[PDB]
Design an enzyme around this catalytic site. Structure first.
Site, mmCIF file in Angstrom:
data_model
loop_
_atom_site.group_PDB
_atom_site.id
_atom_site.type_symbol
_atom_site.label_atom_id
_atom_site.label_comp_id
_atom_site.label_asym_id
_atom_site.label_seq_id
_atom_site.Cartn_x
_atom_site.Cartn_y
_atom_site.Cartn_z
ATOM 1 N N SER A 64 0.787 -1.232 0.082
ATOM 2 C CA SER A 64 0.045 0.199 -0.001
ATOM 3 C C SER A 64 0.802 1.268 0.091
ATOM 4 O O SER A 64 -0.065 2.225 -0.197
ATOM 5 C CB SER A 64 -1.181 0.057 1.198
ATOM 6 O OG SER A 64 -1.987 -1.052 1.032
ATOM 7 N N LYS A 67 -0.028 3.455 -2.850
ATOM 8 C CA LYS A 67 -1.083 4.469 -2.754
ATOM 9 C C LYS A 67 -0.476 5.858 -2.750
ATOM 10 O O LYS A 67 -1.202 6.786 -3.533
ATOM 11 C CB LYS A 67 -1.819 4.161 -1.569
ATOM 12 C CG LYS A 67 -2.971 3.072 -1.737
ATOM 13 C CD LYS A 67 -3.804 3.010 -0.420
ATOM 14 C CE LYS A 67 -4.626 1.750 -0.347
ATOM 15 N NZ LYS A 67 -4.097 0.431 -0.053
ATOM 16 N N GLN A 120 -11.023 -4.828 0.134
ATOM 17 C CA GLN A 120 -10.599 -5.446 -1.168
ATOM 18 C C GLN A 120 -11.749 -5.767 -2.161
ATOM 19 O O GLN A 120 -12.685 -5.877 -1.642
ATOM 20 C CB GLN A 120 -9.866 -6.819 -0.901
ATOM 21 C CG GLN A 120 -9.096 -6.870 0.463
ATOM 22 C CD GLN A 120 -7.829 -6.396 0.333
ATOM 23 O OE1 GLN A 120 -7.348 -6.305 -1.064
ATOM 24 N NE2 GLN A 120 -6.991 -6.083 1.242
ATOM 25 N N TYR A 150 -10.903 2.639 5.134
ATOM 26 C CA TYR A 150 -9.717 2.423 4.541
ATOM 27 C C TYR A 150 -10.264 1.337 3.449
ATOM 28 O O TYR A 150 -10.772 0.183 4.151
ATOM 29 C CB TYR A 150 -8.575 2.018 5.356
ATOM 30 C CG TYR A 150 -7.431 1.935 4.327
ATOM 31 C CD1 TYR A 150 -6.860 0.615 3.981
ATOM 32 C CD2 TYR A 150 -6.410 2.780 4.264
ATOM 33 C CE1 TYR A 150 -5.636 0.321 3.190
ATOM 34 C CE2 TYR A 150 -5.241 2.775 3.347
ATOM 35 C CZ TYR A 150 -4.955 1.443 2.825
ATOM 36 O OH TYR A 150 -3.796 1.483 1.988
ATOM 37 N N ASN A 152 -9.005 -0.513 -0.688
ATOM 38 C CA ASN A 152 -8.400 -0.665 -1.859
ATOM 39 C C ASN A 152 -9.153 -0.380 -2.957
ATOM 40 O O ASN A 152 -8.684 0.440 -4.017
ATOM 41 C CB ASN A 152 -7.507 -2.161 -2.003
ATOM 42 C CG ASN A 152 -6.573 -2.276 -1.088
ATOM 43 O OD1 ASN A 152 -6.154 -1.257 -0.918
ATOM 44 N ND2 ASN A 152 -6.081 -3.391 -0.663
ATOM 45 N N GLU A 272 -1.144 10.320 4.767
ATOM 46 C CA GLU A 272 -1.872 10.511 5.954
ATOM 47 C C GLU A 272 -0.824 11.197 6.916
ATOM 48 O O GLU A 272 0.146 10.676 7.203
ATOM 49 C CB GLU A 272 -2.040 9.126 6.690
ATOM 50 C CG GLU A 272 -3.321 8.494 5.993
ATOM 51 C CD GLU A 272 -3.432 6.731 6.022
ATOM 52 O OE1 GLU A 272 -4.028 6.178 5.537
ATOM 53 O OE2 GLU A 272 -2.667 6.614 7.036
ATOM 54 N N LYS A 315 3.063 6.353 5.433
ATOM 55 C CA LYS A 315 2.087 5.459 5.040
ATOM 56 C C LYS A 315 2.764 3.900 5.163
ATOM 57 O O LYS A 315 3.988 3.700 4.609
ATOM 58 C CB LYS A 315 1.984 5.764 3.460
ATOM 59 C CG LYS A 315 0.825 4.418 2.821
ATOM 60 C CD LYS A 315 -0.475 5.099 3.094
ATOM 61 C CE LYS A 315 -1.543 3.971 2.694
ATOM 62 N NZ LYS A 315 -1.425 2.666 3.477
ATOM 63 N N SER A 318 1.570 -3.407 2.830
ATOM 64 C CA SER A 318 1.764 -4.875 2.971
ATOM 65 C C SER A 318 1.152 -5.645 1.871
ATOM 66 O O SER A 318 0.558 -5.168 0.844
ATOM 67 C CB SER A 318 1.128 -5.455 4.308
ATOM 68 O OG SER A 318 1.617 -4.867 5.563
HETATM 69 C C1 AZR Z 1 -1.709 -2.107 1.813
HETATM 70 O O1 AZR Z 1 -0.504 -2.389 2.056
HETATM 71 C C2 AZR Z 1 -2.972 -2.952 2.118
HETATM 72 N N1 AZR Z 1 -2.764 -4.193 2.139
HETATM 73 C C3 AZR Z 1 -3.852 -4.961 1.415
HETATM 74 O O2 AZR Z 1 -4.815 -4.341 1.133
HETATM 75 C C4 AZR Z 1 -3.455 -6.429 1.379
HETATM 76 N N2 AZR Z 1 -3.299 -7.105 2.366
HETATM 77 O O3 AZR Z 1 -3.072 -6.651 3.509
HETATM 78 C C5 AZR Z 1 -3.799 -7.304 4.531
HETATM 79 C C6 AZR Z 1 -3.063 -7.722 5.686
HETATM 80 C C7 AZR Z 1 -4.714 -6.127 5.228
HETATM 81 C C8 AZR Z 1 -4.787 -8.239 3.727
HETATM 82 O O4 AZR Z 1 -4.511 -9.518 4.007
HETATM 83 O O5 AZR Z 1 -5.409 -8.000 2.980
HETATM 84 C C9 AZR Z 1 -2.679 -7.209 0.064
HETATM 85 C C10 AZR Z 1 -2.808 -6.775 -1.125
HETATM 86 S S1 AZR Z 1 -2.233 -7.758 -2.089
HETATM 87 C C11 AZR Z 1 -1.566 -8.616 -0.988
HETATM 88 N N3 AZR Z 1 -0.795 -9.731 -1.047
HETATM 89 N N4 AZR Z 1 -2.318 -8.293 0.377
HETATM 90 C C12 AZR Z 1 -3.735 -2.647 3.780
HETATM 91 C C13 AZR Z 1 -4.966 -3.018 3.527
HETATM 92 N N5 AZR Z 1 -3.134 -1.222 3.922
HETATM 93 S S2 AZR Z 1 -1.969 -1.313 5.078
HETATM 94 O O6 AZR Z 1 -1.175 0.318 4.766
HETATM 95 O O7 AZR Z 1 -2.694 -0.877 6.572
HETATM 96 O O8 AZR Z 1 -1.063 -2.433 5.120
#
Ligand code: AZR
Length: 361
Positions: A64, A67, A120, A150, A152, A272, A315, A318
């Site tokens: 993320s 973003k 998601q 929050y 995606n 943020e 920011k 993950s």
């Molecule tokens: C951004 O990093 C973002 N991550 C996701 O949307 C995804 N995984 O993160 C968690 C732990 C929330 C999940 O299992 O979905 C993701 C997208 S592709 C992939 N392999 N995982 C999140 C939600 N925002 S963060 O900035 O708090 O990490």
């Protein structure tokens, strides 16, 4: 006193040593900007198996942090008068029928305050035929501008809509309009065959893993970059005057502008921020799945408030095998880029990012 590389080296080594150790991280890449001077550190390997280490050229999935790019990209387009935060979502995607969308503008999408768009996209939505159906049938939890959730699928849809006018696909605009101007020659969306040798393997239960295809992947969590490149990106964001392109510069000023207030935290575009000086506790605990991912009441700051140098911009991000974190204090010209190839707890990263910094302010 102006810290010396070795005292700087002491802090960073002091802090990260034990993290990797107990979080069981294979490789790490971290960069410190101490008085706007970059200092790079790298530990472990990019490829456990093929015994290749973390290099200052190694590519890490930013999850993320992607973003931030989306938001600056949208800001450039805004400056150029191509889009307008207030623009109806329909304007950009007329095909997207249904009254749930009528009072939902570009600000809503950008800033996750549309009405509870999910975190998601149901990955059973693997084509665009399906992404419209999805959005066609979505059911808002709340009226726009009420809660902040929050997601995606929110910002993801902004990215994709925000480049419509220009006639470029997201990847193309991104490249041409932000990546090339800033000279991010090691920042990719689609990692070339030629660069695969620098592209780390993310670890998940000891398995090497790369982020899978996904509707809106690129726009929300699909950018690959190196600690060298991340540092330039932080440098540019931490001070836009250096940016020769008029639109990209303003764009950066726009994404760090404050649109909403969600108790002590303010929302820009991707970025943020917090008023500085900040309570370690606020950001270490607000980074928690439980706060970070929760539906919270947001206070519309409109007209938006302007990027101020005394803020804590940052920011998290993950991906399966990857944990990333970026933070910077414009006013103090300090920043930190922490890139790891193993996903670990957020507040861990954030508290580590604070130990160091704290030591350098
Ligand atoms: C951004 O990093 C973002 N991550 C996701 O949307 C995804 N995984 O993160 C968690 C732990 C929330 C999940 O299992 O979905 C993701 C997208 S592709 C992939 N392999 N995982 C999140 C939600 N925002 S963060 O900035 O708090 O990490």
């Amino acid at each position: 006193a102006a810290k010396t590389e070795q005292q700087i080296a002491d802090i960073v080594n002091r802090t990260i040593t034990p993290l990797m150790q107990e979080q069981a991280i294979p490789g790490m890449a971290v960069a410190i900007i101490y008085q706007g001077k970059p200092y790079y550190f790298t530990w472990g390997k990019a490829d456990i198996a093929n015994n290749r280490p973390v290099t200052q050229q190694t590519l890490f999935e930013l999850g993320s942090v992607s973003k931030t790019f989306n938001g600056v990209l949208g800001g450039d387009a805004i400056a150029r008068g191509e889009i307008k935060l207030s623009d109806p979502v329909t304007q950009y995607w007329p095909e997207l029928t249904g009254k749930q969308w009528q009072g939902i503008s570009l600000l809503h999408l950008a800033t996750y305050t549309a009405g509870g768009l999910p975190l998601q996209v149901p990955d059973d939505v693997t084509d665009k035929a399906a992404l419209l159906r999805f959005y066609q049938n979505w059911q808002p939890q709340w009226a726009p501008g009420a809660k902040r959730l929050y997601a995606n699928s929110s910002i993801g849809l902004f990215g994709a809509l925000a480049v419509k006018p220009s006639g470029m696909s997201y990847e193309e605009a991104m490249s041409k309009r932000v990546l090339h101007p800033l000279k991010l020659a090691h920042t990719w969306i689609t990692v070339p065959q030629s660069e695969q040798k620098d592209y780390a393997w993310g670890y998940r239960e000891g398995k090497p893993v790369h982020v899978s295809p996904g509707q809106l992947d690129a726009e929300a969590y699909g950018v690959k970059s190196s600690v060298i490149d991340m540092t330039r990106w932080v440098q540019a964001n931490m001070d836009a005057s250096q940016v020769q392109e008029k639109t990209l510069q303003q764009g950066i000023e726009l994404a760090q502008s404050r649109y909403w207030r969600i108790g002590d935290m303010y929302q820009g575009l991707g970025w943020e921020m917090l008023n500085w000086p900040v309570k370690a506790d606020s950001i270490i605990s607000g980074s928690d799945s439980k706060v970070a991912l929760a539906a919270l009441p947001a206070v519309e700051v409109n007209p938006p408030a302007p990027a101020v140098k005394a803020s804590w911009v940052h920011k998290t991000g993950s991906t399966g095998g990857f944990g990333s974190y970026v933070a910077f204090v414009p006013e103090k010209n300090l920043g930190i880029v922490m890139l790891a190839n193993k996903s670990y707890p957020n507040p861990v990263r954030v508290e580590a990012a604070w130990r160091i910094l704290e030591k350098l302010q």
